[PDB]
């Protein structure tokens, strides 16, 4: 058939319970996951198509970069909790990747203080039980999709995205079958 288990999309052997409808990883460190974020906007293009009442979820993952990937992802926790992700998300991919302006916890805290958001309001948010159980939950969840690699994408907790069974010649045409791909998984 036109999309088909194997291809574009495998099914995890063991389904997770109460997951969310679609679920991506990624990290600040990640080079593929910069390409993924920065320059295909596979999020954007994915949402864009979702069918109405889909949220998209994001998490951070910790497995890269030692410490500075921890400290992402409790940053990542921070930018969930106020609603800011749009804000820094860029601003982080290029600090960690681009620039490499970013090589501390007070680094991070930068992007955020330039963005906008009140120092206050930041150290609140870092030093918080809100944020300290989302950092929970993104190790929860990678966890729970036997996470062994970033970018990933997972689907109502049953299906993984598979990039590799894909069409990479146009990034277009990669994105579109990507968002193709969410789509009908969502509706499956």
Same mark, same amino acid.
């Given at each position: 058939?036109?999309?088909?288990?194997?291809?574009?999309?495998?099914?995890?052997?063991?389904?997770?319970?109460?997951?969310?409808?679609?679920?991506?990883?990624?990290?600040?460190?990640?080079? $593929?996951?910069?390409?993924?974020?920065?320059?295909? $906007?596979?999020?954007?293009?994915?949402?864009?198509?979702?069918?109405?009442?889909?949220?998209?979820?994001?998490? $951070?993952?910790?497995?890269?970069?030692?410490?500075?990937?921890?400290?992402?992802?409790?940053?990542?926790?921070?930018?969930?909790?106020?609603?800011? @992700?749009?804000?820094?998300?860029?601003?982080?991919? @290029?600090?960690?990747?681009?620039?490499?302006?970013?090589?501390?916890?007070?680094?991070?805290?930068?992007?955020?203080?330039?963005?906008?958001?009140?120092?206050?309001?930041?150290?609140?948010?870092?030093?918080?039980?809100?944020?300290?159980?989302?950092?929970?939950?993104?190790?929860?969840?990678?966890?729970?999709?036997?996470?062994?690699?970033?970018?990933?994408?997972?689907?109502?907790?049953?299906?993984?995205?598979?990039?590799?069974?894909?069409?990479?010649?146009?990034?277009?045409?990669?994105?579109?079958?990507?968002?193709?791909?969410?789509?009908?998984?969502?509706?499956?």
């Amino acid at each position: 058939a036109q999309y088909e288990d194997g291809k574009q999309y495998t099914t995890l052997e063991k389904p997770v319970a109460g997951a969310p409808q679609v679920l991506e990883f990624f990290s600040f460190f990640c080079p $593929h996951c910069y390409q993924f974020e920065e320059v295909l $906007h596979i999020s954007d293009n994915v949402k864009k198509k979702l069918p109405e009442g889909v949220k998209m979820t994001k998490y $951070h993952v910790n497995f890269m970069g030692g410490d500075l990937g921890k400290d992402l992802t409790q940053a990542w926790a921070v930018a969930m909790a106020l609603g800011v @992700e749009d804000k820094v998300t860029v601003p982080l991919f @290029e600090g960690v990747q681009k620039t490499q302006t970013i090589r501390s916890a007070s680094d991070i805290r930068d992007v955020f203080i330039n963005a906008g958001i009140k120092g206050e309001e930041y150290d609140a948010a870092w030093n918080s039980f809100v944020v300290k159980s989302l950092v929970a939950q993104q190790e929860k969840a990678a966890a729970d999709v036997q996470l062994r690699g970033v970018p990933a994408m997972f689907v109502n907790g049953k299906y993984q995205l598979n990039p590799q069974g894909m069409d990479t010649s146009n990034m277009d045409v990669f994105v579109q079958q990507y968002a193709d791909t969410v789509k009908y998984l969502s509706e499956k």
